[PDB]
Symmetry: C6
Subunit: 196 residues, 6 copies
């Protein structure tokens, strides 16, 4: 777990990444993973089991939970991290492949593919930010929700588990994601400026 080994691993052995991309982006990425790990099973572990509705209708609990939580916040963030990390993984594999072929026997190609990688990383961050806004308007969760989907008769009151703690972690993850967007834009601008 040598510091130089961890730095080499996270940097992806890329010769075009700048200081922000090799230090700040990696740290914020680690921060999001650690927050997600400590908050996934602990806070969102009983999201559905503890979800109850004030009714005697069989199946109203499950249908109301599905109505109000089409996809859990933890899974949404997990997908966001995987999708955001994919272009970095592709660049690392491409660099390793180039090292392999040159050992068996370019700089502009590496520069261009890195820039495209950062652009796609920024694009994925923006898309997931918009999707999160679309599914869950606002940032705070409420204790009581009004559910009227079939088979629930009329409108029933359903209660969410730990809405305040989930709100706190939602703010943390959203703030970290916003910082990643800002750093990605700065990285793109810095690369373009240095290219001239």
């Amino acid at each position: 777990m040598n510091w130089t080994g961890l730095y080499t691993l996270l940097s992806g052995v890329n010769r075009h990444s700048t200081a922000i991309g090799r230090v700040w982006l990696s740290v914020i990425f680690i921060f999001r993973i650690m927050v997600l790990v400590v908050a996934a099973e602990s806070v969102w572990g009983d999201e559905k089991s503890s979800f109850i509705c004030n009714t005697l209708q069989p199946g109203c609990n499950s249908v109301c939970y599905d109505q109000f939580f089409p996809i859990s916040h933890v899974r949404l963030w997990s997908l966001q991290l995987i999708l955001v990390s994919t272009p970095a993984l592709l660049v690392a594999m491409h660099v390793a492949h180039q090292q392999h072929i040159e050992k068996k026997m370019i700089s502009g190609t590496l520069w261009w593919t890195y820039v495209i990688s950062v652009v796609f990383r920024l694009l994925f961050e923006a898309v997931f930010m918009y999707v999160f806004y679309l599914l869950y308007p606002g940032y705070a969760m409420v204790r009581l929700v009004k559910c009227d989907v079939y088979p629930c008769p009329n409108t029933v009151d359903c209660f969410v588990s730990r809405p305040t703690e989930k709100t706190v972690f939602t703010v943390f993850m959203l703030a970290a994601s916003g910082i990643c967007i800002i750093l990605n834009v700065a990285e793109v601008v810095y690369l373009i400026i240095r290219a001239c």
Copy 2:
């Protein structure tokens, strides 16, 4: 966890694999594993425990779940990954065996066995895609299902847990599987073209 070590591990130390097979196929394979890991115990963990039917008949819950879910999506994808990864494992073991015997003391054989390996990988992907269609027509799961198998009297209403979230992950896994099929076909065509 050195990048060159991970690249060497995933490539299988094969001298015939092309850029797509050594980069894109490996990345998509990692993507499917990561999605499966984050979605196996979290989303499908309570598939049967949360499955309830609007009835007083003892045993109707278990029999209806078995009727509508002959095999869970997570287990189906787990088997697909194992079966798809098997020909790659066989090639890697064969390469290691050839290295062992040559150290103790061919290229066409390695080329042919690699091509057959890709063909079988494509075949397994296609078969599991068809099996998934056969067991679960369409891609979206429904909240309410009508179950009439014995001992359930007449027809009873049963409710599925997280049908929307399972639908989202179903689309992700199916899309990734389709990409793998396309890349495998491209790999076969590229190898045949380069063989001439």
Copy 3:
């Protein structure tokens, strides 16, 4: 996790094993372990908790489960893998011991002990195949079973959890075990032929 390291580990550093024993047997062994891992806690996790009987008799659930499942399929396969892997472990330890003593300071002995090891591996596979047939005639599990053991009054209906999914994995494990038996017989015949 270098491919040559994994190959050396699985081969057991044996100079008498043939291509089938060093490649195909190891791959099928890995296949059985992976299938068992993905199917142990997921499919058979709730074998007893979800097992219910249509009765009010206290203790009828536990006694009926014990009657129909004297030992779970997962534990039976786990024991089979351990017992089948034991002679390979003994040979590997004996080879390491011979290396140790020769460093501190035979080929026929290694050949004979390897042949006996394969014979015992085949014997254990056959015995567990017969035991599985004896405890669970046929290959498919049924949704409903008729239980009449004390204290259950008369005959009661008990319901099994995921009988179809368990049937699928039973076929997979049985097919893999049959392949291992065939490969072991081929290994013995090939060694005897090469000995002359």
Copy 4:
């Protein structure tokens, strides 16, 4: 897990850290992690499941738990450790980046960034100490709490799980945090004195 390797890892390969920062701060940091690990799932595992209120009102349990525990102590300490560890992680990454660039081809910059890192570490410790006081006045938890939030009618009695054991671990974590604050202040003063 060589002692010099662990020491190098925890020190962050920093040439400006003093004896207290390289020995005592690291030990107390390990102490907090170990206490948190043994007390997270064991003591706070059933914080919400075991939380019950003397009422028949559906949803009163969940709403009262959220009212009295906006964020669990374990998650609060987990966030504190992550935030406190972040400036150390940034310095370690910056040092590794400087090593990388100098290998590809300062002391005052490293000194200043280390001092700022310690100041921010102290600031985060103080902020979380104040937040803990704000959310949970005092240090001891009580067995019985009076909850009157909607939908609970009037005021209901709710009972906390393991309030004495949680009190013991609260004192341990608070004492360790206070020691970290004292050591951080001593580190800042010592660095300033040595700078002159």
Copy 5:
């Protein structure tokens, strides 16, 4: 996980251990660990939760389980493995200490301490075998037990979970323990004979 590394680890870097002690005892020790691992949480996981008694008396379930299972079989075997492994651990530490001191700057002492180690290993095996017989006469567990301890009124019927599967693993562990006793006696006799 190199075979020579595993062999060196299990042998304890001892120059007096014979072939049986370095091969057969280690293999049987691994066998017991693997059987215990696969059978601890799976088979004995619900020993107390699934234990039920045909009564309405509060607390009769817990008191009857304690009466009939003073200590679980899994914990008894876990203690047996730890106690049996302790003298081997002591010898390994003593050998390492002797290597340390000689590097900083005997054979009869090593021989005698090894013989005493085997004697104590045999003694611990015998003691745990007798304790197991004392607590659980016979080898097979029964489905129904008669419990009459306070507060249970008169005599109540209590039902054990998976008595047949637990019986199977009891036979496996007892047989392996008996083999260890035989091998330990053979080791002692062989060492004494070779000493003359």
Copy 6:
């Protein structure tokens, strides 16, 4: 996991530790960790969930468990191990720091700090032994306890889970702790005698 590596790790790379401190204390420390690991989640896992009282009063179960178990035995032993291991960790870090500074560019200081470390280790052992006696007089746990704390009306009967198995592990941990105290006193006396 080389024996010399494990010995070097446990010894802490200390040149003043004697044979007892480098062999017997380390072995007993490993013994306590292993016993704690096998007995933490298995035996004390359901300490509160299985704790029931013969009453209809809501909240009487939780309040009575807190009254009779202010802190669980497992957590008490976990804290004892951490506190006892801390002075050893401090000495190891101090030794590593001295190695670091001497590489960048004493024996009496190392001797004195080691002696103080052993004294504090003995002191922590004694304090936790006294605390355990204070909270839980005697060594054996009882099946039935009489609880009269509010809100429980009058006095209610509450039943403990696995009191006999917990008693067995209590004796094991207490005996091991007593051995550690004896060895620590012997270490202090031996060091003082050798100092003259």
